[PDB]
Amino acid sequence: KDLGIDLGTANTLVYVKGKGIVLREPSVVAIQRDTKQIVAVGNEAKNMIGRTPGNIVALRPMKADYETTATMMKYYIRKAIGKPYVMVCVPYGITAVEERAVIDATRQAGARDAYTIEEPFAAAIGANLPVWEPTGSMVVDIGGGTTEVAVISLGGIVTSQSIRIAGDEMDEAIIQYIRKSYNLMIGERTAEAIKMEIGSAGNPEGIGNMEIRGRDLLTGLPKTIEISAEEVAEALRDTVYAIVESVKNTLEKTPPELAADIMDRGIVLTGGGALLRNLDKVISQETDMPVIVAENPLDCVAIGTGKALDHIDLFK
Ligand SMILES: Nc1nc2c(ncn2[C@@H]2O[C@H](COP(=O)(O)OP(=O)(O)OP(=O)(O)O)[C@@H](O)[C@H]2O)c(=O)[nH]1
Helix, strand or coil: CEEEEEECCCEEEEEECCCEEEEEEECCEEEECCCCCEEEECHHHHHHHHHCCCCEEEECCCCCCHHHHHHHHHHHHHHHCCCCEEEEEECCCCCHHHHHHHHHHHHHHCCCCEEEEEHHHHHHHHCCCCCCCCCCEEEEEECCCCEEEEEEECCEEEEEEEECCCHHHHHHHHHHHHHHHHCEECCHHHHHHHHHHHCECCCCCCCCEEEEEEEECCCCCEEEEEEEHHHHHHHCHHHHHHHHHHHHHHHHCCCHHHHHHHHHHCEEEECHHHHCECHHHHHHHHHCCCEEECCCCCCHHHHHHHHHHHHHHHHC
């Protein structure tokens, strides 16, 4: 059996050729404070912390100990399943020493051999763009920690860019806007809920208002206020600008013929971050190019990592 593993910032997905996305579990680990050892991974850690055994702490490795990686991979590989060949999705900006570290750890986790794929190429394969044709295609993968842009043609990446401004950074910007605007400190969970509920990249008209709670910075005491979609859009302006610039910087680095094909096919957005309302419209208006959101934007990467198992030669 061959496995494709997308160990995301918050969510891990395992794909087994044949069965498809067999596993969906949080990118979470549970570590004994005293033994300083990984006691559980994924749902097992969730259950552990959920049973509250004490002396356990829960951590998300996010963006890296070779041991944490190898242990995590050991759990997801065994739970999903004579040893497997594993395609591991990696961010675009990954160095070669890091990429070798992922392979050794995956090999230590129980893989015959391991191969890596850049998230943008996987996202493109999962979103059914014609990656193998000599036509140019563009994918924008906006996750939690990273936004990654790439142009693909003939089973390779022509040009690509990565930025650390993405879904998490949208939440931060909301938190910072409310800190400055209302002298109120909200947490991550509330910031995420605001982005999901009333967040938008632009045209916040009709999105609505939300009551939120946080810590007043003068008094230290909890406080409830009303936040508008208009304000949240402003709070996300610069974050959205940054994403638009990387798309434009990638086009400026694209050959004309491929740049001309993308103007016809359009740009595909993948990743949970791409669910920010009207981001597709904003990027389209600023690029003068069709922009669409992929059909299954949260599973594209994992599906692409799974389908990449059929051309394992290329990644070998
Ligand atoms: N605006 C908005 N964001 C969402 C929504 N649902 C999920 N997200 C965001 O999706 C992001 C993570 O989604 P994924 O595409 O799975 O990213 P990831 O694979 O876990 O992390 P990466 O490794 O960087 O790709 C988080 O930042 C979430 O806030 C939604 O409905 N609206």
